[PDB]
Design a protein around this motif. Sequence first.
Motif, PDB file in Angstrom:
ATOM      1  N   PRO A  40      -8.158   8.176   1.972  1.00 48.57           N
ATOM      2  CA  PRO A  40      -7.518   7.429   0.905  1.00 48.57           C
ATOM      3  C   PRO A  40      -8.229   6.135   0.616  1.00 48.57           C
ATOM      4  O   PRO A  40      -8.832   5.625   1.542  1.00 48.57           O
ATOM      5  CB  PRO A  40      -6.119   7.160   1.466  1.00 48.57           C
ATOM      6  N   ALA A  41      -8.177   5.628  -0.611  1.00 45.40           N
ATOM      7  CA  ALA A  41      -8.748   4.309  -0.895  1.00 45.40           C
ATOM      8  C   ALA A  41      -7.669   3.330  -1.349  1.00 45.40           C
ATOM      9  O   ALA A  41      -6.665   3.719  -1.926  1.00 45.40           O
ATOM     10  CB  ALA A  41      -9.833   4.414  -1.936  1.00 45.40           C
ATOM     11  N   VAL A  42      -7.957   2.042  -1.153  1.00 50.47           N
ATOM     12  CA  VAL A  42      -7.075   0.957  -1.569  1.00 50.47           C
ATOM     13  C   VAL A  42      -7.926  -0.133  -2.196  1.00 50.47           C
ATOM     14  O   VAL A  42      -8.937  -0.506  -1.623  1.00 50.47           O
ATOM     15  CB  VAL A  42      -6.275   0.368  -0.392  1.00 50.47           C
ATOM     16  N   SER A  43      -7.546  -0.589  -3.387  1.00 51.61           N
ATOM     17  CA  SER A  43      -8.303  -1.630  -4.070  1.00 51.61           C
ATOM     18  C   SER A  43      -7.353  -2.707  -4.583  1.00 51.61           C
ATOM     19  O   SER A  43      -6.168  -2.474  -4.799  1.00 51.61           O
ATOM     20  CB  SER A  43      -9.132  -1.034  -5.194  1.00 51.61           C
ATOM     21  N   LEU A  44      -7.911  -3.896  -4.730  1.00 48.32           N
ATOM     22  CA  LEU A  44      -7.245  -5.091  -5.197  1.00 48.32           C
ATOM     23  C   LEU A  44      -7.777  -5.411  -6.587  1.00 48.32           C
ATOM     24  O   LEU A  44      -8.990  -5.597  -6.726  1.00 48.32           O
ATOM     25  CB  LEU A  44      -7.540  -6.266  -4.241  1.00 48.32           C
TER      26      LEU A  44
ATOM     27  N   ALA B 234       0.835  -1.191   0.000  1.00 53.65           N
ATOM     28  CA  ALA B 234       0.000   0.000   0.000  1.00 53.65           C
ATOM     29  C   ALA B 234       0.865   1.234   0.000  1.00 53.65           C
ATOM     30  O   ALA B 234       0.966   1.945   1.012  1.00 53.65           O
ATOM     31  CB  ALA B 234      -0.927   0.009   1.185  1.00 53.65           C
ATOM     32  N   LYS B 235       1.525   1.436  -1.136  1.00 53.63           N
ATOM     33  CA  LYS B 235       2.462   2.523  -1.314  1.00 53.63           C
ATOM     34  C   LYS B 235       1.795   3.619  -2.127  1.00 53.63           C
ATOM     35  O   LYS B 235       1.559   3.457  -3.310  1.00 53.63           O
ATOM     36  CB  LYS B 235       3.724   2.027  -2.003  1.00 53.63           C
ATOM     37  N   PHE B 236       1.503   4.726  -1.462  1.00 51.88           N
ATOM     38  CA  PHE B 236       0.842   5.858  -2.087  1.00 51.88           C
ATOM     39  C   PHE B 236       1.823   6.833  -2.710  1.00 51.88           C
ATOM     40  O   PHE B 236       2.977   6.938  -2.296  1.00 51.88           O
ATOM     41  CB  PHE B 236       0.003   6.609  -1.060  1.00 51.88           C
ATOM     42  N   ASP B 237       1.319   7.591  -3.668  1.00 52.60           N
ATOM     43  CA  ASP B 237       1.983   8.737  -4.240  1.00 52.60           C
ATOM     44  C   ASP B 237       1.113   9.959  -4.007  1.00 52.60           C
ATOM     45  O   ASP B 237      -0.103   9.860  -4.061  1.00 52.60           O
ATOM     46  CB  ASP B 237       2.226   8.527  -5.729  1.00 52.60           C
ATOM     47  N   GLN B 238       1.733  11.108  -3.766  1.00 57.80           N
ATOM     48  CA  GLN B 238       0.960  12.308  -3.451  1.00 57.80           C
ATOM     49  C   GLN B 238       0.071  12.771  -4.615  1.00 57.80           C
ATOM     50  O   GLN B 238      -0.991  13.329  -4.388  1.00 57.80           O
ATOM     51  CB  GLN B 238       1.890  13.440  -3.045  1.00 57.80           C
TER      52      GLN B 238
ATOM     53  N   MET C 167      -2.857  -7.047  -8.275  1.00 56.02           N
ATOM     54  CA  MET C 167      -2.175  -5.851  -7.826  1.00 56.02           C
ATOM     55  C   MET C 167      -3.024  -4.995  -6.926  1.00 56.02           C
ATOM     56  O   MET C 167      -4.234  -5.125  -6.896  1.00 56.02           O
ATOM     57  CB  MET C 167      -1.713  -5.044  -9.035  1.00 56.02           C
ATOM     58  N   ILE C 168      -2.366  -4.144  -6.155  1.00 60.29           N
ATOM     59  CA  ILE C 168      -3.070  -3.247  -5.250  1.00 60.29           C
ATOM     60  C   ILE C 168      -2.876  -1.819  -5.726  1.00 60.29           C
ATOM     61  O   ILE C 168      -1.768  -1.388  -6.040  1.00 60.29           O
ATOM     62  CB  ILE C 168      -2.602  -3.470  -3.808  1.00 60.29           C
ATOM     63  N   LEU C 169      -3.994  -1.122  -5.863  1.00 57.40           N
ATOM     64  CA  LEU C 169      -3.981   0.276  -6.273  1.00 57.40           C
ATOM     65  C   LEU C 169      -4.317   1.176  -5.083  1.00 57.40           C
ATOM     66  O   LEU C 169      -5.240   0.908  -4.312  1.00 57.40           O
ATOM     67  CB  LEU C 169      -4.947   0.526  -7.432  1.00 57.40           C
ATOM     68  N   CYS C 170      -3.549   2.253  -4.948  1.00 56.86           N
ATOM     69  CA  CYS C 170      -3.634   3.164  -3.822  1.00 56.86           C
ATOM     70  C   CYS C 170      -4.010   4.535  -4.329  1.00 56.86           C
ATOM     71  O   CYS C 170      -3.295   5.100  -5.139  1.00 56.86           O
ATOM     72  CB  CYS C 170      -2.304   3.243  -3.069  1.00 56.86           C
ATOM     73  N   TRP C 171      -5.148   5.043  -3.859  1.00 57.99           N
ATOM     74  CA  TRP C 171      -5.776   6.235  -4.404  1.00 57.99           C
ATOM     75  C   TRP C 171      -5.802   7.292  -3.320  1.00 57.99           C
ATOM     76  O   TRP C 171      -6.571   7.162  -2.372  1.00 57.99           O
ATOM     77  CB  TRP C 171      -7.221   5.961  -4.839  1.00 57.99           C
ATOM     78  N   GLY C 172      -4.990   8.323  -3.465  1.00 58.15           N
ATOM     79  CA  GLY C 172      -5.120   9.495  -2.625  1.00 58.15           C
ATOM     80  C   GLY C 172      -6.480  10.156  -2.808  1.00 58.15           C
ATOM     81  O   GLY C 172      -7.242   9.883  -3.744  1.00 58.15           O
ATOM     82  N   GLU C 173      -6.788  11.015  -1.862  1.00 55.56           N
ATOM     83  CA  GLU C 173      -7.977  11.837  -1.944  1.00 55.56           C
ATOM     84  C   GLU C 173      -8.019  12.567  -3.272  1.00 55.56           C
ATOM     85  O   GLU C 173      -7.081  13.276  -3.633  1.00 55.56           O
ATOM     86  CB  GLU C 173      -8.010  12.840  -0.799  1.00 55.56           C
ATOM     87  N   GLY C 174      -9.120  12.403  -3.996  1.00 50.03           N
ATOM     88  CA  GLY C 174      -9.292  13.059  -5.260  1.00 50.03           C
ATOM     89  C   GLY C 174      -8.611  12.393  -6.441  1.00 50.03           C
ATOM     90  O   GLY C 174      -8.677  12.924  -7.553  1.00 50.03           O
ATOM     91  N   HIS C 175      -7.934  11.267  -6.213  1.00 52.51           N
ATOM     92  CA  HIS C 175      -7.252  10.584  -7.296  1.00 52.51           C
ATOM     93  C   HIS C 175      -8.207   9.723  -8.066  1.00 52.51           C
ATOM     94  O   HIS C 175      -9.062   9.091  -7.491  1.00 52.51           O
ATOM     95  CB  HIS C 175      -6.119   9.701  -6.796  1.00 52.51           C
TER      96      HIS C 175
END
Length: 186
Positions: A146-150, A47-51, A69-77
Amino acid sequence: ELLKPRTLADLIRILHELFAGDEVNVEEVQAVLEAYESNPAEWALYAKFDQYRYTRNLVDQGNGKFNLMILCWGEGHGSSIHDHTDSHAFLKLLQGNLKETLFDWPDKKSNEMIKKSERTLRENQCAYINDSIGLHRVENVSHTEPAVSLHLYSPPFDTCHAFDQRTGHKNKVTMTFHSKFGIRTP
Ligand SMILES: N[C@@H](CCS)C(=O)O
Ligand SMILES: [Fe+3]
């Protein structure tokens, strides 16, 4: 014979069994993905986010049959409007909420892509799409979470198309991994 995945590791083992053959039982794969109860400790490694944008973090290569894979979604991403390259695409929420907006395949003629429908995908829910169904956009519209999806793609693919909502015009995109097996891959 489908059993509840006890852990992310267990899920992966089960998925390897379900993709041991040449075809895909979509309802069974979706059922097992849904049945896994997200445990943040099990996927924190991934769960590695980018700004600035959402990240794609490879978890398993499925013995060649699928990419998990795991997708990491910042606020508004969020994503483009996109297809899935003649592959199966499963999306399970692990944390937060994502908005999925559905679009039809555009006609040859340039035209606004009008949304067909939208839903809010909530924690642990699993959505499915493929090109015969249509296109979609996936967005974390939260201002505070933040959201995280598989995601599971079969066969694996690393290219797809982004669609211009104003015209329906598509452009080829190559997707990159932010990390693989827990390791940042710059
Ligand atoms: N297919 C997209 C995300 C939504 S399914 C991707 O891997 O970037
Ligand atoms: Fe997608």
